[PDB]
Amino acid sequence: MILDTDYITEDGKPVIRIFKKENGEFKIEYDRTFEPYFYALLKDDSAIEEVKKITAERHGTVVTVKRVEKVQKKFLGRPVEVWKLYFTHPQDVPAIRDKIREHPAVIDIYEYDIPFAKRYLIDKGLVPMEGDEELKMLAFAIATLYHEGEEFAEGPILMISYADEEGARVITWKNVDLPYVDVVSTEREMIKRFLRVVKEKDPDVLITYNGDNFDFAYLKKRCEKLGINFALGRDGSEPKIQRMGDRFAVEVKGRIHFDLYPVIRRTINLPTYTLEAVYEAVFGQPKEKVYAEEITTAWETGENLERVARYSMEDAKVTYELGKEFLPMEAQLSRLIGQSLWDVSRSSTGNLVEWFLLRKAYERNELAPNKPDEKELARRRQSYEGGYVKEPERGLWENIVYLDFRSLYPSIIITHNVSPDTLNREGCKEYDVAPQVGHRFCKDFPGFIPSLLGDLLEERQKIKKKMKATIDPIERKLLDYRQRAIKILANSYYGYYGYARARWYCKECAESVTAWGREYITMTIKEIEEKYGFKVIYSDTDGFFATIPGADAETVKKKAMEFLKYINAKLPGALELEYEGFYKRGFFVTKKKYAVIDEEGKITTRGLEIVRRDWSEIAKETQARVLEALLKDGDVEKAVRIVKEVTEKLSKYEVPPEKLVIHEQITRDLKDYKATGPHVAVAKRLAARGVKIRPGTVISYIVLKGSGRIGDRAIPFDEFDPTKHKYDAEYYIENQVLPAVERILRA
DNA sequence: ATCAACTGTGGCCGTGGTC
DNA sequence: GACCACGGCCAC
Ligand SMILES: Nc1ncnc2c1ncn2[C@H]1C[C@H](O)[C@@H](COP(=O)(O)OP(=O)(O)OP(=O)(O)O)O1
Ligand SMILES: [Ca+2]
Ligand SMILES: [Ca+2]
Ligand SMILES: [Cl-]
Ligand SMILES: [Mg+2]
Ligand SMILES: [Mg+2]
Ligand SMILES: [Mn+2]
């Protein structure tokens, strides 16, 4: 399989490098014959002799058009000849493209901002991560000597650990007597020993956990202090530290640096994303956390270096086993998008959608539209109407079925051929008309994006079908992440229609999809109440909860399956209503907030404070206890005993102050806030101390006894000290616990 | 490193403002 | 005390 592509320049000329792994052998293929290009549409064919002569400049070297070639293509499905303008070097394209657009005989240019390495993969029809090839993988982690108030990486690395299928080992330059610790003389020898281990094991994948931001930058600083050529790349290069939006990412040429953190962060929802928490979340086994401050007094005193060597070895071991499980996911997503796993695992969703569309456009001989310029961008900032959300019939309900549409919006795009190249296209025999908003969509030929969503949905449903044939629970959970990731990707094609930066943008298409969605779900609700006598308890966009009031579980289930047959035979094309579960009891508080219990006593809760990252644990823990006493047992006297038992204790100061921490993210530069709530008030004070707040910083604070604004008496939970701070028992009772549990206990 | 960043809307609710 | 906008996080 192909791992990655890039290019280098030799004596002015690009050379594509393709990093392959075939038959257990690593190979670099070199391509010097593939040419960079973009396209120009001309007012007339005669003007090509002029456009051919346009020149630019690029660090003193004159940029010319190398050769041109006339090609027939489609733009939004409509045929058109354009001129493919070829250049000697990729960097010619940004140097000359504006001078070509500016030429009065040039109506427009296209595909002029496509990175050459990825251009190569698309035009060659090459897909990374294809084939039976078993990649060799190696995880690594580092233990560092930390002192608070020092510069980054001022202290040494104390241990480097790596793990793979042969096991886990720790390299260190302190005298640790353990069987997996290899002892060397200096920090420099330790790094050099790791470098040699990577060269000897020669892994295809290097796995870290946040190595994009920590491990590699630390290594780089130490190698700079120590005079070490950190030649981890298969071509002898050092790790290449690239900028990616607000943060960094690191590549190792010839291998795949799979940083697990961005992948895990986007597919599992957790309170904290410590390596320990993730490992517990995925496998169910506990992993211990030795702290950067237990580490530092252990190294200076000699004691408990073996416990640190064990925490370092565990870090590498779990990092490996995690990468073992998640690589198939990202290798499949990499195969579907047609780009490298390094890129696909790190990039925004819109960008994946678009790289997928550029490849399909190439395969179909469709010219790509350009990104919007700043004028068009400002024009695309109108919003539109979305899904329908019924106000729930509040309270407790028995024998509830949950019926839900299979991939609704993508199904609508497929069924009604909803796409920019079919919108109000004249001349067709057949049209579907969007309700409320009126846009017409031609049905005579598949639309570009409609013809792509079907293979995605098919892929997802096969994964779900295979989820049904496997007994292994961990393997079933990983299959669950994969099909959910495809669900999100397919739905992002719909959102992409409304995305101001999209090339194939189409706000008519996006509001047509939602309008069809409101039509289908509300027709389904009317159908199930009028023909079958159900009562729709609650509904959100494409599914609903319903019961036959007074009927037992068997009757509600049988009559629910009857309705599905009826409705699914009325529904056209790819629309399909699905049976998504039966619940013995349910409690619906407001829109988006409810909890149900299945016929096994497993509670599923949605939107309620229990699941929110920004409510205090004491509040979440109490509402969880109230809910469980409420839906499992029919014990209203138990729930009320729990809240009163928590009121006292908080008032008596008997509840641990760790359960009162509020976590809220900073999302912008602190100057740009217009409303200063408690998490901003704490963060602005940190900024005044030189703590360097940035978007993404989580404020973890606690509220102390007082009466002013809440931000006035909030401090970082760091600075909490029981000898000196009594917390605000009245705040945590009247503003955190009681509000949460009372909205439930109103019924 | 060469663009990439940031798929869409609906909705609750605590906070700290105005009036 | 009535009301409303901001901001964060969640459900689709
Ligand atoms: N993350 C999202 N981005 C954009 N639109 C979304 C997203 N999540 C949901 N929607 C929209 C499009 C969905 O088809 C519709 C209904 O949501 P939902 O029931 O969760 O998903 P679904 O119908 O695509 O999948 P499933 O087959 O699992 O029910 O709401
Ligand atoms: Ca060469
Ligand atoms: Ca049907
Ligand atoms: Cl760009
Ligand atoms: Mg569903
Ligand atoms: Mg749904
Ligand atoms: Mn659905």
3-state secondary structure A141-192: EEEECCCCCCCCCCCCEEEEEEEECCEEEEEECCCCCCCCEEECCCHHHHHH
Note the helical H segments in A247-348.
Answer: 260-267, 275-283, 292-301, 305-337, 341-344
Pair A205, A345: CB distance under 8 Å: no
Tokens of A95: 């140097």
Pocket of ligand 1 (CB under 6 A): A 387, 404-409, 487-488, 491-492, 494-495, 541-543
Residues 6+ apart with CB under 8 A from A600: none
d(CA A741, CA A421): 52
d(CA A85, CA A92): 11
Of all protein residues, whose CA lies closest to atom 24 belonging to ligand 1? A407
CA of A564 to the centre of ligand 3 (A): 10
d(CA A333, CA A328): 9
C-alpha dist (Å) from residue A425 to A394, A439, A440, A502, A512: 46, 11, 8, 21, 15
d(CA A22, CA A130): 11
User: Containing H/E element for A42?
Assistant: strand A37-42
Q: Determine how β-strand A137-144 pairs with β-strand A205-208.
A: parallel
Pair A323, A258: CB distance under 8 Å: yes
CA of A742 to C1' of C2 (A): 22
Which ligand 1 atom is at minimum distance from the Cα of A411? 14
A569 conformational bin, left if phi > 0, alpha if psi -120 to 50, beta if neither: alpha
Closest to A392 measured CA to CA, from A596, A609, A611:
A596
Tokens of A352: 């994946």
Helices A260-267 and A305-337 meet at what angle, rounded to 10?
70
d(CA A9, CA A456): 38
d(CA A594, CA A395): 10
Closest to A608 measured CA to CA, from A599, A622, A598:
A622
Name the β-bridge partners of A5.
A18
Mutating to test ligand 1, I would choose from A491, A604, A606 the residue with most ligand atoms within 8 A of its C-beta, which is: A491
3-state secondary structure of A668: coil
> Which residue is listed with tokens 């998490």?
A679
Of all protein residues, whose CA lies closest to atom 6 belonging to ligand 1? A491
User: In 10 A of CB A270, how many CB atoms?
Assistant: 13
d(CA A700, CA A679): 8
Pair A496, A515: CB distance under 8 Å: no
Residues 6+ apart with CB under 8 A from A470: A476, A479
3-state secondary structure of A727: strand
A277 conformational bin, left if phi > 0, alpha if psi -120 to 50, beta if neither: alpha
Residues with CB under 5 A from ligand 3 (ion): A 571
> Which residue is listed with tokens 């289908």?
A520
CA of A544 to the centre of ligand 3 (A): 19
Q: How was this model experimentally determined?
A: X-ray
Number of H helices, E strands in chain A: 22, 28
d(CA A331, CA A719): 44
Pair A488, A267: CB distance under 8 Å: no
CATH for the A137-345 domain, from 2.30.130.10, 3.30.420.10, 3.90.25.10, 2.40.30.10: 3.30.420.10
Residues 6+ apart with CB under 8 A from A737: A618, A619, A622, A643, A646, A647, A650
> Which residue is listed with tokens 């989580």?
A698
Residues 6+ apart with CB under 8 A from A718: A700
Closest to A586 measured CA to CA, from A605, A567, A611, A607:
A605
Q: Determine how β-strand A395-405 pairs with β-strand A240-244.
A: unpaired
Measured in Å, how far apart are chain A's first and last C-alpha atoms? Answer: 60
Nearest-Å Rg of the Cα atoms of chain A is 30
Tokens of A639: 């729930």
d(CA A496, CA A518): 19
d(CA A160, CA A172): 7
- For A704, which DSSP code? B
What are the percentages of helix, strand and coil residues in chain A, rounded to 5?
40, 25, 35
> Which residue is listed with tokens 């919007």?
A372
User: Containing H/E element for A720?
Assistant: none
> Which residue is listed with tokens 């401050």?
A293
Using the CB atom, is residue A542 less than 7 Å from strand C? yes
CATH of domain A609-745: 1.10.132.60
d(CA A584, CA A588): 14
DSSP assignment of A324-382 equals HHHHHHHHHHHHHHTS-HHHHTTS-HHHHHHHHHHHHHHHTTBPPPPPP-HHHHHHT--
Query: For residue A451, how far is the Cα from the chain centroid?
Result: 25
Closest to A40 measured CA to CA, from A92, A102, A119:
A102
Pair A136, A165: CB distance under 8 Å: no
Sequence positions preceding breaks in chain A, C–N over 2.5 Å: none
Query: For residue A669, how far is the Cα from the chain centroid?
Result: 23
Pair A636, A628: CB distance under 8 Å: no
User: In 10 A of CB A15, how many CB atoms?
Assistant: 15
d(CA A307, CA A145): 15
- For A399, which DSSP code? E
The three-point CA angle A96-A99-A104 to 5° equals: 145
Closest to A520 measured CA to CA, from A493, A542, A495:
A542
d(CA A230, CA A219): 8
Which ligand 1 atom is at minimum distance from the Cα of A410? 14
Of all protein residues, whose CA lies closest to atom 23 belonging to ligand 1? A407
Per-residue buried b or exposed e for A181-211, using 16+ beta carbons within 10 Å of the residue's own CB: bbebeebbebbbebbebbeeeebbbbbbbbb
- For A670, which DSSP code? G
d(CA A233, CA A255): 7
CA of A68 to the centre of ligand 6 (A): 51
Burial class (CB in 10 A: 0-12, 13-18, 19+), A178: middle
Q: Determine how β-strand A535-539 pairs with β-strand A256-259.
A: unpaired
CATH topology assigned to domain A2-124: DNA Polymerase; Chain A, domain 1 (3.30.342)
The three-point CA angle A601-A605-A608 to 5° equals: 145
Residues belonging to chain A:
747
User: Containing H/E element for A91?
Assistant: none
- For A542, which DSSP code? S
Using the CB atom, is residue A484 less than 7 Å from strand C? no
Closest to A498 measured CA to CA, from A373, A384, A353:
A384
**Sign of the alpha-carbon dihedral angle for A10, A125, A128, A503:** positive
The three-point CA angle A286-A292-A294 to 5° equals: 85
3-state secondary structure of A677: coil
d(CA A506, CA A366): 17
Pair A130, A91: CB distance under 8 Å: no
Name the β-bridge partners of A193.
none
User: In 10 A of CB A689, how many CB atoms?
Assistant: 7
Contacts 24+ apart (CB under 8 A), A487-492: A487/A407, A487/A460, A488/A349, A489/A333, A489/A336, A489/A349, A489/A352, A489/A353, A489/A456, A490/A407, A490/A410, A490/A453, A490/A456, A490/A457, A490/A460, A491/A407, A491/A409, A491/A410, A492/A349, A492/A350, A492/A353
> Which residue is listed with tokens 């029981």?
A722
Resolution in angstroms for this experimental structure?
Answer: 2.1
Pair A118, A355: CB distance under 8 Å: yes
Note the helical H segments in A19-66.
Answer: 48-52
Tokens of A211: 């190595």
3-state secondary structure of A248: strand
CA of A58 to C1' of B5 (A): 27
d(CA A674, CA A693): 17
d(CA A151, CA A221): 11
Pair A161, A145: CB distance under 8 Å: no
User: Containing H/E element for A413?
Assistant: helix A408-415
User: In 10 A of CB A686, how many CB atoms?
Assistant: 17
